[PDB]
Amino acid sequence: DSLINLKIQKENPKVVNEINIEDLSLTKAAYCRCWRSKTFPACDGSCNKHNELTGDNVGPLILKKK
Amino acid sequence: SLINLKIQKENPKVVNEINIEDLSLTKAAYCRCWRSKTFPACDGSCNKHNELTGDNVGPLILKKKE
Numbered sequence: 001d002s003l004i005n006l007k008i009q010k011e012n013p014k015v016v017n018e019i020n021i022e023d024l025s026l027t028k029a030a031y032c033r034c035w036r037s038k039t040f041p042a043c044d045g046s047c048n049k050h051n052e053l054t055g056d057n058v059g060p061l062i063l064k065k066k
Numbered sequence: 067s068l069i070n071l072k073i074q075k076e077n078p079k080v081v082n083e084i085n086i087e088d089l090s091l092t093k094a095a096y097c098r099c100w101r102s103k104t105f106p107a108c109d110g111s112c113n114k115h116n117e118l119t120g121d122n123v124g125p126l127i128l129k130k131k132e
């Protein structure tokens with residue numbers, strides 16, 4: 001095991017994001033689980049770049065309403 | 067260097083979809099560290115990860131209420 005998050009909110013000892021499900025604007029939203037997104041906590045597809053470089057297989061949580 | 071060490075490594079890209087209507091609790095933590103034994107749920111494995119590796123990752127908390 002080693003660091004997952006390299007640069008996101010490093011002054012925060014534990015980065016936890018709350019989502020109010022009742023207010024989901026979109027029908028489907030992608031949330032980041034690679035800590036590489038430039039729009040974290042949203043997924044911006046940086047996962048794919050990480051996966052290609054490293055051979056990893058990480059991907060987002062997709063939230064669907066309705 | 068990998069983020070996900072163990073979860074479904076045969077899967078080209080691990081993406082989980084959550085149907086909002088199936089969440090019954092006022093909060094449900096979802097893992098962003100790839101260490102949970104209940105992945106995609108968070109089981110608090112993030113904490114020991116952070117303690118041992120010097121990281122600061124934590125879950126996405128999906129909150130629901132009447």
Ligand code: FES
Nearest residue numbers: 032033034043047
């Ligand atoms: S940018 Fe991180 S999961 Fe897609």
Ligand code: FES
Nearest residue numbers: 097098099108112
């Ligand atoms: S167990 Fe992974 S974020 Fe909590």
